[PDB]
């Protein structure tokens, strides 16, 4: 199992006309596999949607993925911006 | 377009780790 493969490639034709949105070298970088989209980085480790307790067929349409991601409440953020100045 | 072999970018491990960025240490004329 090797480590030092290249795994990125560049085509010789300068097509740099409509490409300011992609990832440029500074040309266009062309990798050997796709990307990986990760929804939320921090798992919410309790929350019986995920913990599955052993007590007591049901569906639930939760709002967004933001339930599973430890977001702070806004009153603390306003308190901290008041503590800013 | 299907005959357009691409250029590998080699990393060369010792370049990736710790390369710094000689007359500017004045002891050698």
């Amino acid at each position: 199992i090797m480590i030092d493969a290249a795994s990125s490639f560049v085509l010789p034709i300068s097509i740099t006309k409509n490409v300011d949105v992609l990832q440029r070298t500074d040309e266009i970088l062309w990798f050997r596999g796709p990307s990986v989209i990760v929804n939320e980085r921090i798992i919410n480790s309790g929350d019986p949607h995920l913990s599955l307790p052993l007590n007591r067929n049901e569906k639930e349409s939760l709002p967004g993925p933001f339930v599973l991601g430890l977001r702070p409440s806004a009153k603390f953020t306003a308190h901290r911006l008041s503590m800013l100045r | 377009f299907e005959t357009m072999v691409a250029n590998p970018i080699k990393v060369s491990r010792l370049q990736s780790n710790g390369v710094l960025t000689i007359h500017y240490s004045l002891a050698n004329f």
């Binding site: 062309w30 929804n39 709002p63 | 299907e2 072999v5």
Partner: protein, 198 residues
């Protein structure tokens, strides 16, 4: 209870708007009050036919009701679509408006919450389904067949509110959609695996 709930959103959305100046952009009255999926086609019709967001709070345009925040969501989505269409797709003030839309839409979705298959024929026969479902927007990458290397691209930073036709710098490109992988994280190894004696 809803008194401070506008004041905090005011303070946060002011202080998180320094580098891009979204809030101080020009915005007339624009009485739509419509379906948010029609929110660009209605403004397209407003362009075809014929007071900013900071000043709306100072005039008290928002009440402690459901519509009093639905209008705020509507105004944010309008200003973000305007600032997306105004700039090109690669400028930094494009991506700042995209990030600000993501952050503010996430901030406004929460805290108003506080306030046919043979495999299925086997498993629904064998198990009990307590469940959970949600929506995410996917993104795109490009696609190239060279001589036996079969490359891929990076993620295009085109926003979800762009609505433009898909331009292509080459017709030998292809486009693909990347499904995000999401599940209980596979049990990571212990710290004895990460940093043993070499």
């Amino acid at each position: 209870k809803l008194v401070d709930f506008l004041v905090n959103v005011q303070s946060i959305l002011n202080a998180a708007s320094v580098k891009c100046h979204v809030v101080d952009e020009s915005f007339p009255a624009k009485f739509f009050e419509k379906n948010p999926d029609k929110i660009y086609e209605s403004y397209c019709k407003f362009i075809k036919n014929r007071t900013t967001i900071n000043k709306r709070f100072e005039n008290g345009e928002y009440e402690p009701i459901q519509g009093g925040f639905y209008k705020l969501y509507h105004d944010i989505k309008l200003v973000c679509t305007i600032l997306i269409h105004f700039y090109p797709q690669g400028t930094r003030n494009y991506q700042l408006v995209d990030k600000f839309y993501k952050f503010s839409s996430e901030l406004l979705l929460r805290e108003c919450c506080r306030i046919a298959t043979e495999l299925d024929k086997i498993i629904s026969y064998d198990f009990i389904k307590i469940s959970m479902n949600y929506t995410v927007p996917i993104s795109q990458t490009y696609q190239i067949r060279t001589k036996d290397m079969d490359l891929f691209s990076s993620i295009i930073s085109k926003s979800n509110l762009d609505k433009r036709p898909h331009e292509l710098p080459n017709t030998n490109f292809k486009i693909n959609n990347v499904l995000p992988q999401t599940d209980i994280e596979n049990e990571a190894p212990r710290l004895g695996f990460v940093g043993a004696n070499t």
